[PDB]
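Hi,

I'm pasting everything inline rather than attaching a file, because the server keeps stripping attachments. The sequence lines come first, and each chain or strand is labelled.
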Amino acid sequence: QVQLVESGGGLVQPGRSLRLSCAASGFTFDDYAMHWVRQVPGKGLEWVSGISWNSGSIVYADFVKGRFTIARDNAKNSLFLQMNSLRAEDTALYYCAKSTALRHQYYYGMDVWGQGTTVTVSSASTKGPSVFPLAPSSKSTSGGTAALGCLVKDYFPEPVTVSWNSGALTSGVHTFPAVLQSSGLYSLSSVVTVPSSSLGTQTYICNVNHKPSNTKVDKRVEPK
Amino acid sequence: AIQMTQSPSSLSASVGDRVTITCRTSQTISSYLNWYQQKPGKAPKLLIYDASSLQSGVPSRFSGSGYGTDFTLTISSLQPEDFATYFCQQSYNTPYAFGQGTKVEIKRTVAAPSVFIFPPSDEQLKSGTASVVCLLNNFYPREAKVQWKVDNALQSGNSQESVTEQDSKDSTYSLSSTLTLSKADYEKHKVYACEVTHQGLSSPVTKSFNRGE
Amino acid sequence: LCPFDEVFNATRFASVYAWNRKRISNCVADYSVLYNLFFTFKCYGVSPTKLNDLCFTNVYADSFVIRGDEVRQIAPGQTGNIADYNYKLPDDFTGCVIAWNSNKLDSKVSGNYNYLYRLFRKSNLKPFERDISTEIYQAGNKPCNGVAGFNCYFPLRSYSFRPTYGVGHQPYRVVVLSFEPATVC
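And the predicted assembly:
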């Protein structure tokens, strides 16, 4: 299938630089214009930059000025965005988009979008998340449905990803949106409802991934 | 520039209703308006391009119209999986600016929350902080009040709440209430209770545990 | 006899941006191809049952090809990409419009990109205006100088008529007859 995947996101202090990449597969990358689109937490989509198939046409939105530089390597099927003099308002999740209309016509739409990469500009520090099990008590489950989860506390920046049983368990999972604590860090809980009968026989593991800090933590959630 | 103004900013409709979203341009963009759908935490997906051309794979219930200004996106029969945010984006002139967005919500029959309380782990207590989590799962309507009681003492200010976006499958909400105490303060008490009120509940639902048990 | 067979029974039609016009004058009009009609028929300013009793100075036969969703624009007081940028009819248009589905003629399995249509134009077309210019359309603030890129696109695009498309995207051959010494009786 057609596919785009962004990379290079992470923490960067104000004024410093960061380089984003976009790897393409499943289509003729050399024939289509590519775009960068970002989204402020809570706000709407904002177009950043685009580039023609042969790089003869290159654009930037006004909030880019002379700080960012878009480029592409058709031999490597890769799109790039060099971000310099980053500011706090550049904090957003950056999408890489392929243009529907073939060749030099970028007036139709972006059919294919990547999952995006998160960029956070802050004069803070890359803190890793602590993962604690949310186990049910001995006498506290009043139903044929039990609840368990994992507290993912004190990380920076966004985002973190939580999967259950390495992605095999998806039904009934609720990964709550993060909250900004007074300390300045983010914290969220990921829960899942499972048959109460499965507590004694089955194993439940939450898999937390924090790419900016390269943190990967597995935590088995067992009854107390 | 080409400012894109969407109306409404938010709407609430039920499954099967006919939803129409309006998108206006600061100047004429001919017929190159595009519609996109974005789920919370997911990437946007193309629905309509060139004002009226349906993208391959998009259900036929989506349809776009308009020319010059006042473009309209129409969902003939709203389904549970259409809960998202719909953006319009002009492609006549760079920058390919987007609209402010129109968040579509779905309503459903009242569903009382299932309540679960979680004590802090021994691992977290070793580090000086205790977090007590109360889960309100798969409920509608969204309104709920969580009151923390520690040895029958109502807490205040030491709790934070987080609510999921309305589920795309059952149109319900989930809510987490986290009570944050110091390890010293946590170990001074035995009883930790979470009391939940909801318009679907005739009486408040209290889930509690005894520390160390 | 007025050459009406050459317009309707033509093997190849023109694109909507370069619509062909056949000037018909000094002839006896055997109204039979439009007199009775998978044939759409829209008349403006005149009745067909009275056409045999009227003499005109000149009768113009405009022929081109569009898709099904664009036939509604071939009419007086209509807006759209076809009406504003390809073929416009005046508000006091005196004549009839004929259109029929030609999916069995102008649609190939691999796509028939031969038929074209004008996308971008700086202003709207006057009634009965034909613009065959292929200059790179300037949409932005920088000049184009014949360069196809960002904000400098080709003003013409292809229809890509495939038989597996919906009725709204299938080719429709349109014949617009305008009724202007009176010699066409």
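The two ends of chain B are 64 Å apart (CA to CA).

If the labels don't parse on your end, tell me and I'll reformat.
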